[PDB]
Write a structure and sequence with these properties.
It is classed as transferase/isomerase. The entry lists the keywords inhibitor, antibiotic, chaperone, membrane, bacteriophage, TRANSFERASE-ISOMERASE complex. It forms a hexameric assembly. The entry is titled "YES Complex - E. coli MraY, Protein E PhiX174, E. coli SlyD". The complex is a heterohexamer, with two copies of chain A, two copies of chain B and two copies of chain C. Chain A is mainly alpha-helical. In chain A, 58% of the residues lie in helices and 3% in strands. The longest helix of chain A is centred in the first third of the chain and has 19 residues. Chain B is mainly alpha-helical. Chain B has one domain. Chain B is built from 14 helices and no strands. In chain B, helix 2 packs parallel to helix 9, helix 5 crosses helix 6 and helix 6 runs antiparallel to helix 10. Chain B is globular. Chain C is mostly beta strands. In chain C, 10% of the residues lie in helices and 38% in strands. Chain C starts with 6 loop residues before the first strand and ends with a helix. Classes of the chains: A mainly alpha, B mainly alpha, C mainly beta. The interface between C and E is medium-sized, with 23 and 11 residues. Strand 6 of chain C pairs antiparallel with strand 1 of chain E, so a sheet runs across the interface.
């Protein structure tokens, strides 16, 4: 048959609506899936975060025995 | 197949009778999947590099020791074939549910394979055309769901469970096909988003596979099925074997798939694992448990949908990027930290779902 | 002869912003060359130039999204002063290149601080509509080096 | 407290009955540990940073974020407080076993704190003489072991279990004290030795805690005890709550201790977790199970002793250092990669340890 | 009382021998607990790479397209 | 009075290599103070000086194993010139200080390239055999500041 009680319909609709976002990704053009400009922003983030201000300073003298 | 050969050799040596017990089969399947993945890894990565890039390469820092230049993006073959071999060796081949899971896994794996190959050799900007990819995904999912419904017509196999209510459990009839479509294809496409953070997709996948193994073990026994109040599917006894095989394959891939990944999983592995998880959640009446346990997948898909909805209606951005883990990445969280935080979240939700099924 | 993929298009054009201010011009005596079907040219301009014969004079209106991506608040972002090299002191309007996994990405300085500087990667025309008055001076086949680049 | 308060309040409201069941208590223990950890952080991060560097330093935007500089080394206080709070709230005070675990944990955390505090507030490393730590560690361990021995002798409570075989099982006399001392102190040392990498030690601790939680659940029931042929220690039932709280605290800490860790575990957390694992493996007749499940710690310390003995006797160095993690760090494996390597190894070992109980 | 069969003492010795390394940090010299020659070199190797992570370079370009 | 733990040693030493070339010398008129029981110095000198009375004259042979350690090829690495400052043009033989998390370690330039340089972080005496002629001029207890340092 078909789900009868209001609880049945509510549960089925809730589960479908929770699986709905993963299946409406089908209709999203790839451009909106990952804009190229924002990808360049993430690449900038990776490079900048890789940057470290530690930078070799000169040494007065070496250690002694 | 070896279990059949164990039934054959038991008559000559009683020692082989140990191969029949479920626990030994599960543990040995896990170990064999891990060992085959480990054996294949170093050869597969080098071979893929030759295909993808120059024949001779070697890690150098920081341009490749801590960065991901020159890393192949076709390593999902490891997961696919490890799962296939472990299941087909240590799982009963006469059970139709194992065959169903394997065929779904193989179909999604070949789709991912052709997509990755289109991207790595022909360098097409669109890669695999969306229409063909999605058409094949849909034909596979709809055929499998139709076969399962025909098998389970007017039979508890077509019922729907609810995490916190026991008495509500309708018989979906033809809507079983629609539900199978939604869970299989949705999780197959949701695991695709999760691949973009250097192993964010191998887990939850592993923890979810373990939870599904436990559920199938409980589901496959009359006493445990009655105590937990789950529909009883005799063939669930071998679904646990496939779940342990998936755990083994995922851990074997994570062997080489940690920051910095020696190989990206790609579609060949992501689609394979997502389809395997969705199909397992179909044969086991555990769609809600997949939703609860796989919170990262559903959250990333909801995040992309919500970001495009914002772009359409408001024009603002709810999250800096469509995948929410990438939004955290932009916030400042480094990949090694976001990946493990999402692993924490996935494990927490897996335990929460297991407890919820414990209580119902 | 008409524009086609793998062909170099020498471009002489006069471009005005959305507000209507000229940015600069490319004289017919020294047209600028650009590949076709590779994405180097602006998407709207590249689509407009498809199939046009040599010497054709036309005006094409390209929106902000069509020309580039909309202004991104993620692209603009901070960075310490120490990271920089090749410049003793940062002034607004400077341009720098950050070499990245994905590829080269230019940036420009928009504000400065005593021990801090905010860096912007957005193009000057990223968030502004553009109108192009383009004339195709000549067309020629792309060289191997040009295709590689 | 809450368990007793709920028991008293049942008649006022019947909804309090839910708090009595073991599964719910364990689940809320895990959730409460995680909540306490995520609530102390990042507030505790800033408070402790002011202590160690004299000021709450910042990442200063995309500055160096993957260095040991700028990270406090007092992270274990969060673990201690979370475990204590969760145990006190969701465990029965009456059972002496929970009190033994709690006293061991608190004592070891204090011994680690007296070392770390002097490490910070003093420039040179010899602020605390290792002998103080070492002696008080031994004293608390011996006291607890002697108390457990006297609590029961000639009874299953003092019977070591052989992991694979079941027929071979001795009844221990005063030697039980030596076994407990060895297990607790060695586990504390190894967990302390494993904290060289921020995320290396906590996750294996979580895995062993979960394994011991499952074993205690099996140990605390006559039916399960006779099914697995493991001694039935009645007081061991509440140890499930302690193990689940440890798992939750470890997850909450690793939420902040992941590479690049915002704070290092330090002596406090490492010693406390090691002592908790040791006392759990002593109360449960599962010393060999601690060796198998916690194989990462044992192998690390074995490598340490092997390297030092090789230096002492011969000129060749078997490893590049005493620990394994550094040895692979120079083999070409970066820090987060090797952290996940050890995580996978620990997961496999804990699964094998859980499996070996069924071969009895 | 005391153990009786060979397998009992065998198992106890196997247990103790496995825990003996875990407790041989008891008597391990401090000079050898943390090596020095390579440890210095190890942290120095990491710091060296961390110093050379990235560099930001100037640009001199022209208008588009 | 003899040498003991946590005692400062005023050292006047004459050290020579196995080849027979001097590297440094501390005269008796200005002994160099050092701590004891810490191991920061050469292990051989530290161990031999143990239990020696004040004013005693002795000679001890020091090997590579007894020294800071053997030579390791990982300490010599090519690194760009941008990772130096404080020099108008990176010169050959200059010494630099890597501010490692463990502590200060030296970095010396072995060669210079156009945009890069070759440096080595290993100690000068690493992998060498040495002979120490030493004399304990005086002995005193270490101060709190000295112990902290």
């Amino acid at each position: 048959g078909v789900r009868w009680t209001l609880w049945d319909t509510l549960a089925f609709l809730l589960l479908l609506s929770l699986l709905l976002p993963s299946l409406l990704i089908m209709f999203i053009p790839s451009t909106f899936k990952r804009p190229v400009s924002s990808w360049k922003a993430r690449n900038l983030r990776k490079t900048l975060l890789m940057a470290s201000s530690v930078r070799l300073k000169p040494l007065n003298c070496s250690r002694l025995p | 197949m070896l279990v059949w050969l164990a039934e054959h050799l038991v008559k000559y040596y009683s020692g082989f009778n140990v191969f029949s017990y479920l626990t030994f089969r599960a543990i040995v399947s896990l170990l064999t999947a891990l060992f085959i993945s480990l054996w294949m890894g170093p050869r597969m990565i080098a071979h893929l590099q030759k295909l993808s890039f120059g024949q001779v390469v070697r890690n150098d820092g920081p341009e490749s020791h801590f960065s991901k230049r020159g890393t192949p993006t076709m390593g999902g073959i490891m997961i696919l074939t490890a799962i296939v071999i472990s299941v087909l060796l240590w799982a009963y081949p006469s059970n139709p549910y194992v065959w169903c899971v394997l065929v779904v896994l193989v179909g999604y794996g070949v789709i991912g394979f052709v997509d990755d190959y289109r991207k790595v050799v022909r360098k097409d900007t669109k890669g695999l055309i969306a229409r063909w990819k999605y058409f094949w995904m849909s034909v596979i999912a709809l055929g499998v769901a139709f076969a399962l419904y025909l098998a389970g017509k007017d039979t508890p196999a077509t019922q729907l469970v609810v995490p916190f209510f026991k008495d509500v459990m309708p018989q979906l009839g033809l809507f079983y096909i629609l539900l199978a479509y939604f869970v299989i294809v949705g999780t197959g496409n949701a695991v695709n988003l999760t691949d973009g953070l250097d192993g964010l997709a191998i887990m939850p996948t592993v923890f979810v596979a373990g939870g599904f193994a436990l559920v199938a073990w409980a589901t496959g026994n009359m006493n445990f099925a009655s105590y937990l109040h789950i529909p009883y599917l005799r063939h669930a006894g071998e679904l646990v074997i496939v779940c342990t095989a998936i755990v083994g394959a995922g851990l074997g891939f994570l062997w080489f798939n940690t920051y910095p990944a020696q190989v990206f999983m790609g579609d060949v592995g992501s689609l394979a694992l997502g389809g395997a998880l969705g199909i397992i959640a179909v044969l086991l009446r555990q769609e809600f448990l997949l939703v609860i346990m796989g919170g990262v997948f559903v959250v990333e898909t909801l995040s992309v949908i919500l970001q495009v909805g914002s772009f359409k209606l408001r024009g603002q951005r709810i999250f800096r990027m469509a995948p929410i883990h990438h939004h955290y990445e932009l916030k400042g969280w480094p990949e090694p930290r976001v990946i493990v935080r999402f692993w924490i979240i996935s494990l927490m939700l897996v335990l929460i779902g297991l407890a919820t099924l414990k209580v119902r | 002869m008409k524009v086609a993929k793998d062909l170099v298009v020498s471009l002489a054009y006069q471009v005005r912003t959305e507000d209507g201010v000229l940015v600069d011009e490319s004289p017919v005596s020294a047209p600028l060359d650009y590949l076709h079907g590779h994405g180097s040219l602006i998407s709207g301009l590249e689509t407009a130039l498809e199939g046009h014969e040599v010497g054709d004079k036309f005006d094409v209106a390209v929106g902000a999204n069509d020309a580039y991506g909309q202004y991104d608040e993620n692209l603009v972002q901070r960075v310490p002063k120490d990271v920089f090299m090749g410049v003793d002191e940062l002034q607004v309007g400077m341009r720098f290149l950050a070499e990245t996994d994905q590829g080269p990405v230019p940036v420009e300085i928009t504000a400065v601080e005593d021990d801090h500087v905010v860096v912007d990667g957005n193009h000057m025309l990223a968030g502004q509509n553009l109108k192009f008055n383009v004339e195709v001076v000549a067309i020629r086949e792309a060289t191997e080096e040009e295709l590689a680049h």
